[PDB]
Amino acid sequence: TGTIETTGNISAEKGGSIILQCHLSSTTAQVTQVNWEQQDQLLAICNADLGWHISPSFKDRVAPGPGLGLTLQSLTVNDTGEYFCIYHTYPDGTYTGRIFLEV
Amino acid sequence: MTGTIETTGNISAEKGGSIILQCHLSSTTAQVTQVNWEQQDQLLAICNADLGWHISPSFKDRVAPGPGLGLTLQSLTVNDTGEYFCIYHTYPDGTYTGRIFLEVL
Amino acid sequence: DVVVQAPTQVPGFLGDSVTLPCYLQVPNMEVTHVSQLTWARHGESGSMAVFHQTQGPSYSESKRLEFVAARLGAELRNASLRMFGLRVEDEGNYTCLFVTFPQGSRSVDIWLRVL
Amino acid sequence: DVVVQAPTQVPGFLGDSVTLPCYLQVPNMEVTHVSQLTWARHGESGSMAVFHQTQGPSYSESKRLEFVAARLGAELRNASLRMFGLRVEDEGNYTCLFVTFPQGSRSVDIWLRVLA
C-alpha cells in the first residue's frame, strides 16, 4: 500500500557521524510511532505524543533527528551491520525499512 | 565561527533504486536562509525558507523534495554516480557545505 | 519487563468462531504506555486488525474480525482477537503486537489450526 | 541568465582603503529573488561579511569591513564591499556570492593584492 524509502546502503569513516533516515510515502496513514532497531537491539523510539526515547546503550553517542531519523555519533566498526526503521501506523499497521551500514 | 554538517553517508545503491539524501547542520544558532542541492556541473534543487522548494527542470521527474531539507532520488541510473553537495546559506555564519558520494551499480 | 502472554496454538472449528488470546502483562512497579494493537499474518507487514488509542479499531480482512477486549478511554492490555466463521484458508501463524513506549514492540506468534 | 560582474583583480595600498566591487546583473525579462549576500576568503566555509534581506549586514569579527552599496528594503543587487586600514594579511583571494532563487548561487573570485 505504502512504501518506505531509506538512505540505502552506506559507508562512513571510523569516529565520524552518520544520519539514518526513512520516509513513509504513498499512504495517508497516521504514524503512531517509529522504532529504530538492530536485529536484537532497540536504539530509539520517536513517539508522536511522547517524543524521543533513546536506549541507554546508545544515549551518549546518538542524537535524535533530523525528523524521525537518527544520528549515529563516534562510529566504531562495531556499529557495522543492519539497521531497521519500523513505522507503527494507523490504520495500515507496520511498515519496515532496512538500512545497511559499513563503518 | 562554528558549524558542522553531518550527512547520510556515502552511498552505493542499485539501478531503479530510490535513495534519500540528507544533511544536518549543527553546533550553531545561525538561521538557515536556504539550502542548495547541487553537483559541480549543475543545481538539483533548492529549499528556500520563504519560497519553499524549487526543483531544476531536468530533475523534476525523478527528484522528490524532502524529507525535511533532504532530497529523494528516484529511478537511480549509473549516471547518477558522482559527488553531491548540500550547501547551507545561513546568517550570520555564512556558507556550510556537506558532501555525499553516490555510487550506482 | 512488559511481557505478552498467549498460547502458542489455538484450534478452531470450520465455520465456527474462535478467539486468539493475546495479553500484555505489565508489572505494577513498571511504567509504560501502549499506543496500539496490531495483528497480522506471520511474515506479512501491515495490519489485518489494528486498534489505536484514539482512533479505536479497524479491521481490514473483513467484518469477520473483532477486538473482544480493547476499548477507547481505557488502557490497552488485552489485544484478544475473535475470528468468525473460520476457513480452511484461515490456518496459519499470526502475530499479535503491542506498540509500547519506551519498551518498544512486544509481540508473539500464535498458530491458528482449522478443523 | 543572471550573471555576476566584478573585476578579476583589485589593488590596494597598505594603510589605505579599497572597495571590492561585486554586482548582480539581472535582465529585465528574468525573474529572480536575492535573499542574501556572502563574502568569504576563497576556499573556506563560513563567512567574512554577510548581508541579509531582513537581518541586515553582519561582519564576522572585523570592524574593518562595510557593505557600501546595499540597504534594507531595496532590491539586493550590489554586494560591493569596502575594506578599511588595509594590511599585509589582507592580501588574498575572496569569494563574493549571491544567494538567489530559483537560480541558486552566483559567485566570483577576486584577488586582493596589497601594495606598499
What domains are defined for chain D? 1-116 (2.60.40.10)
What sign for the dihedral angle of Cα C57, C23, C87, C41?
positive
C window 91-110, beta carbon within 8 A of A: 97, 99, 101-102, 104-105
Q: Which three cell numbers stand for residue B26?
A: 549543527
What sign for the dihedral angle of Cα D41, D45, D50, D52?
positive
Q: Which three cell numbers stand for residue B44?
A: 538539483
Contact B24 A101 (CB under 8 A): no
Which residue from A minimizes the CA distance to B21? A7
Enclosing domain of residue A38: 1-103
Contact A/C (≥3 CB pairs under 8 Å): yes
Give the single-character DSSP code of C22.
Answer: -
Phi/psi at B60 (5° precision): -50, -45
Contact B91 D102 (CB under 8 A): no
Q: Which three cell numbers stand for residue A74?
A: 563516534
What element of type H or E holds D96? strand D92-101
Contact A37 C104 (CB under 8 A): yes
Phi/psi at B84 (5° precision): -145, 135
User: Residues A65-101, buried b or exposed e (16+ Cβ, 10 A)?
Assistant: bbbbbbbbeebeeebeeebbbbbbbbbbbbbebebeb
Which residue from D minimizes the CA distance to B2? D46
Contact B10 A8 (CB under 8 A): no
Count of C-beta atoms within a 10 Å radius of residue C5: 11
Chain C positions in Cβ-Cβ contact with residue A4 (cut-off 8 Å): none
Count of C-beta atoms within a 10 Å radius of residue A3: 12
Distance CA(A95)–CA(D45), nearest Å, equals 39
Which of A30, A45, A86 faces C101 most closely, judged by CB atoms? Answer: A45
- Taking alpha carbons only, the member of A73, A59, A78, A80 closest to residue A15 is A73
Contact B20 A9 (CB under 8 A): no
Decide if A84 contacts A98 (C-beta within 8 A).
yes
- Taking alpha carbons only, the member of C88, C87, C115, C109 closest to residue C4 is C109
Contact B9 A21 (CB under 8 A): no
Decide if C32 contacts A50 (C-beta within 8 A).
no
Distance CA(A57)–CA(A53), nearest Å, equals 12
CATH number, domain at A46?
2.60.40.10
Distance CA(B90)–CA(B3), nearest Å, equals 10
**Position A93, amino acid:** G
Touching C (3+ Cβ pairs <8 A), the chains are: A
∠ at Cα C109 (C103, C113), nearest 5°? 160
Which of B1, B31, B50 faces D60 most closely, judged by CB atoms? Answer: B1
Domain total for chain A? 1
Distance CA(C63)–CA(C85), nearest Å, equals 11
Q: Which of A21, A72, A79 to mutate to test the interface with B (most CBs of B within 10 A)?
A: A21
User: Residues C17-37, buried b or exposed e (16+ Cβ, 10 A)?
Assistant: ebebbbbbebeeeeebbbbbb
- Taking alpha carbons only, the member of A66, A8, D18 closest to residue B11 is A8
Q: Distance from B13 to chain A by nearest Cα, in Å?
A: 6
**Position D108, amino acid:** V
Contact B94 D105 (CB under 8 A): no
Distance CA(D66)–CA(C39), nearest Å, equals 66
- Beta bridge partner(s), residue C96: C39, C108
Elucidated via: X-ray
Q: Which three cell numbers stand for residue C66?
A: 473483532
Q: Which of B10, B23, B24 to mutate to test the interface with A (most CBs of A within 10 A)?
A: B24
Chain B positions in Cβ-Cβ contact with residue D58 (cut-off 8 Å): 91-92
Distance CA(A100)–CA(A7), nearest Å, equals 9
| Reduced 3-state DSSP string for chain A | CCEEEECCEEECCCCCCEEECEEEECCCCEEEEEEEEECCEEEEEEECCCEEEECCCCHHHEEECCCCCEEECCCCHHHCEEEEEEEEEECCEEEEEEEEEEC
- Taking alpha carbons only, the member of D102, A76, D92, C100 closest to residue B50 is D102
